[PDB]
Amino acid sequence: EFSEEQKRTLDLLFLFDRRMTEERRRWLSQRLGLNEEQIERWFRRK
Amino acid sequence: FSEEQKRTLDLLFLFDRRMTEERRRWLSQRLGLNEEQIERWFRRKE
Amino acid sequence: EFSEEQKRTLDLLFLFDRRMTEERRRWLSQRLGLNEEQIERWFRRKEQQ
Amino acid sequence: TEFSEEQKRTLDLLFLFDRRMTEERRRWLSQRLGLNEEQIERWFRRKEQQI
Ligand SMILES: [K+]
Numbered sequence: 001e002f003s004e005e006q007k008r009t010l011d012l013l014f015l016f017d018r019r020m021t022e023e024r025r026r027w028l029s030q031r032l033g034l035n036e037e038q039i040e041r042w043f044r045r046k
Numbered sequence: 047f048s049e050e051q052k053r054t055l056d057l058l059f060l061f062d063r064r065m066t067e068e069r070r071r072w073l074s075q076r077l078g079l080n081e082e083q084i085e086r087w088f089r090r091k092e
Numbered sequence: 093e094f095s096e097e098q099k100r101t102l103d104l105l106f107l108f109d110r111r112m113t114e115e116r117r118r119w120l121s122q123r124l125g126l127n128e129e130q131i132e133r134w135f136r137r138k139e140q141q
Numbered sequence: 142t143e144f145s146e147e148q149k150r151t152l153d154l155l156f157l158f159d160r161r162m163t164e165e166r167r168r169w170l171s172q173r174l175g176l177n178e179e180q181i182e183r184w185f186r187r188k189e190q191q192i
């Protein structure tokens with residue numbers, strides 16, 4: 001179903017998306033003055 | 047938490063949900079698969 | 093200076109940052125009620141400042 | 142003026158967000174392609190003025 005090059009591209013964007021979501025939590029915590037426990041509890045609710 | 051923080055949070059939730067949709071289109075165009083076929087892969091990658 | 097399985101990775105994210113910047117502009121116009129030509133050059137004219 | 146305060150308050154936010162994600166993307170690439178943050182940023186500055 002998925003080629004080796006198509007799965008290679010998806011696996012790159014998945015890891016990249018995972019990293020950006022982590023850093024946003026680090027960035028929002030620093031900026032909004034919150035702990036990473038809360039903001040991730042926020043984004044998981046919605 | 048502050049009523050100016052749900053601002054920064056509700057925006058980036060709407061911002062990121064819009065980018066996820068558009069990532070799925072761009073991937074459907076660059077790779078050749080449909081969007082369901084892409085959205086299913088990202089989901090099963092958890 | 094680079095590689096062939098390192099340039100693709102850089103090429104992919106460049107086309108991806110390219111697409112995400114366009115759509116953001118479209119999404120901001122829809123939301124802030126501005127046009128895409130205002131947005132496009134308010135942004136990255138802030139690297140001017 | 143041309144831009145609203147309630148609009149500029151969104152535009153400023155996403156500029157800092159994008160600027161921060163661009164930093165971390167470079168690092169994430171500098172720690173995955175073996176190259177460095179002046180190599181990676183050079184490549185992106187090159188393709189930017191068309192390649
Ligand atoms: K839910």
Ligand SMILES: [K+]
Pocket residue numbers: 072075076
């Ligand atoms: K396309």
Ligand SMILES: [K+]
Pocket residue numbers: none
């Ligand atoms: K399923």
Ligand SMILES: [K+]
Pocket residue numbers: 172173
């Ligand atoms: K890593």
